[PDB]
Ligand binder design. Sequence first.
Ligand code: M5V
Lengths: 930, 170
Amino acid sequence: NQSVVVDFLLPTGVYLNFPVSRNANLSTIKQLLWHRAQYEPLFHMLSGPEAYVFTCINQTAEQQELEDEQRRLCDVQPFLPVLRLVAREGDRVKKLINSQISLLIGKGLHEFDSLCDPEVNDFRAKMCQFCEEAAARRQQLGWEAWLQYSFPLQLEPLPNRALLVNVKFEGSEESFTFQVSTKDVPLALMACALRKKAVEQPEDYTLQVNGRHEYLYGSYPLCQFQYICSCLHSGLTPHLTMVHSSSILAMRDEQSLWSLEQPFRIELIQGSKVNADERMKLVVQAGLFHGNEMLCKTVSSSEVSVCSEPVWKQRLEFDINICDLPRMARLCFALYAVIEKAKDCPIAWANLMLFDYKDQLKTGERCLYMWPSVPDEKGELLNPTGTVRSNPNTDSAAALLICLPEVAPHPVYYPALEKILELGRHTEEEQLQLREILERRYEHEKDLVWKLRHEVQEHFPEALARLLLVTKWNKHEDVAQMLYLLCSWPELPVLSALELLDFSFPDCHVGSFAIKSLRKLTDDELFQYLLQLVQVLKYESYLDCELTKFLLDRALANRKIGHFLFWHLRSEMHVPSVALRFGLILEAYCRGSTHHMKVLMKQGEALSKLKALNDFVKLSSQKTPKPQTKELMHLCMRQEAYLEALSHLQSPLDPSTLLAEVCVEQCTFMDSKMKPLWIMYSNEEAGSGGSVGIIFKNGDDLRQDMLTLQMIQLMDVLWKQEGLDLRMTPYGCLPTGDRTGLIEVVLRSDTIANIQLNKDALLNWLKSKNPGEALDRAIEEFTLSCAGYCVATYVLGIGDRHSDNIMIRESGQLFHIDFGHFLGNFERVPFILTYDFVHVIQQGKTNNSEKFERFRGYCERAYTILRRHGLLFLHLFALMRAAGLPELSCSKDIQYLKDSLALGKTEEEALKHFRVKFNEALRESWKTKV
Amino acid sequence: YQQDQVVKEDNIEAVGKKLHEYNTQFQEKSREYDRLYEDYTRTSQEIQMKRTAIEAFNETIKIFEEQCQTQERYSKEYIEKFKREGNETEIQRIMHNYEKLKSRISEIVDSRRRLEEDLKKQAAEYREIDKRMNSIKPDLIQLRKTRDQYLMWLTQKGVRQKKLNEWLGN
Ligand SMILES: N#Cc1cnc(-c2cccnc2)nc1N1C[C@@H]2C[C@H]1CN2c1cccc(Cl)c1
């Protein structure tokens, strides 16, 4: 069926019911309405069509004033086809943004209201206010400030030659080729093109790489930019365009406790919606927590028999006073199914903060909607690392009913900083012992470190992490003394701050200190760790935290950061335990970023179409052969709604890249289990390349591949930072939704298997793509890249490496794909040389000792640089345990990276064992081929 | 003067046979749980989607109930004004249109009811899924701890990693 029957509610109570086309825009639907209303009661009372706006109930169950009438009804997606005419009344701006926020984040803003939660209401009020302020503040400043927000510089982390450049102006056919050196500042290069005849000043201008939103400006040389550097190595002329400051403004213009010494205790009233074996009996094990370690011993209930609605009415008393509870104290419950014990199944769990978001010790009834216990290796009693947020499936999910007893007549808070700092104030063999414990390159050691805690501050400031762990958080005296030191502790480097963000350090003062040290991060370096910081939010107790404030600050100062923060958050909105937290951050992000909100809408619509286009192809693959399915895919793409939605959008993978015109003939899908779509684009305003693609994946989880690709990109940066380009291909990868995302298409490449299937075909393939003088370059590209991907794969523990999942570019550059497994999970993955790669490295000779020794140096140098930054990888990997990746879940998985980089060993000890593992790979290269 | 062991067989090849069996029994029960955990999560997403669709019906009906309210208030002035004009035609057109409006509200209410019935069913499935999950957990934990106890027994006895891997890996 093409047309839909639509219900119209006119403002005089009148009701029309007639068919319209799905692809018809709202403006057209209104003309058809008014033409029909004519011949119905009370028409003379209506104002003209332009006086009213249509209104519907959208897919997220909210009313939406449909202000854009050049918008198809199929793209509106009303719940039922019901359109109500209402007045073009009140503030259109606030009603429009709220509606778009709901459709963008995949969660209706009314769902936040419906909770009736003060914490949520206080977050929304403060963050939306702060974000609007920053955005209003953003709009006042000039075109310099705005271009840096919008299109921040893409720079490389050293010869001085010269080559020509194609320069022109905006809205002009004629172009100017002329010389310029590699070490010229872009202020000077503009003046050269400004000398057209012999009118205008070049300080009222900026250079733009045409066909992309990348801009060349600021006090930096031409060679340090990504475009110019990429152009120099390949051997092509930089195509740029001059743009006036007025043209940039055209883009811009849019708009008390310590007295209470009674033991802590809780009343366990009832359970609800429990589903279990009727033979057994139910138990509720419980314990108090601060981070990983316990505050006291774990209590337990009596064995009430199994039913849906088990009742206990027990007093549970814990060995700790109410005065001794730290700010981040954490009551953790686990419902267990035990046998009668006449001669163990964890059902579910739930955690709760004893204090609330305004520091008030909680009192009265609480209904803790439990999450079910997934069974794992270290089968612990309780789940203290789990979220404190309640299960949002309140209708069906299990529940425990508890009641915190009243402690006093007036409500008791946690002491403020001043009263904490009040009680906080109050040669040697000890100096040698303390150095031995900390200078590493247990309860006896803990009590030593505690005694000399002030000497740790003076002499071992980087050891704070160790000191916070040795502190006894079940005594408010010790807590008071530790915080006192932290308040005057020297600023630690970023590397140490990253460690302090781990779940072991839950206290609000530690996070605050951590984030204080993270404010020195540049946008480039911050971007390198963005994935890890987002995942740390899952360890947060409360909604309003310093990390959320920090990530929002950085997201509003830099449009690239905001973009990737958005998608990192948006891609997990389907996950119940963070939908709320992430939902609110995204709302706050949008209100301060209403311009980028438009770009993100255009992408989200594209990604909604592709899902549908994939789901069709998935079913159409099982029905028919591929060439017909390929044609049936194109017909669905040719449709006006589809074609426009997939066309003219910024790439989610890289917002500076412009996906203009879909080349429908070039489009197809790759042969795989989930049948991912190969969507190709072209941009006639762009440079010499001017052809980009994206692989739309839906069915498989891509978080593994992104993490892996993130960490290789970090290696490449670390190597490039030390003057070592290993010619790596850090292709984009971005999760966008539920088991959904995008991969960047690397053109001019294939898998080694399909090069070999079509004497040695690997060196022949490179010969056909790089004839003559080009071949000697192409082998060096291969050698450098083979080195880097050999070291990367080894260090990360990536097995399963074969010809079907390694690819090679026509330039010679080798690279890997489909990183399903890592850290040796599925035993140490050995270092791997292949005969085929060594064959090509040596230029097709038996012995090329000169060339192969350069390669051994590249592997050896690469491996040495990563060891220097080994704590960086451990810290980053430690925070990714929050993500719940199957293969990154425990200390053993982190221990793998420690051993693979030989961090326990000395530097030269590491080199000797690496060479041994190198040599054995050269030995095993011959045996594998036979 | 210390006891602990819970392993059944006595010979190294006999214990290694039971290592292969219990491991195979473990990996099958894990696949059973994972299959059930997919349903749990899928049903959790489906039920939530049904609950927001019910909120959508409510908000839709709520808009129809306002249209009813407005029709009653707004007609009052014109039904009298056209009756003094002797125009029972213009009155009769208004009321049938209002009868048509009310007939549509009964269609939308019936559809809301059908979804409420389906949400009632899928809430029951969710609970049964959760019950079967919780009935499989004790076996899954049993089979893991046995598997490990046999691994340690053979590792203490000196059995090499290659003999262990061929019992496990297959
Ligand atoms: N198999 C496979 C394969 C997987 N991944 C990537 C990849 C991965 C990251 C970046 N770029 C590319 N390439 C792959 N190759 C398959 C061949 C060459 C290249 C793309 N070709 C292709 C194009 C359209 C349709 C079909 Cl059936 C095949």
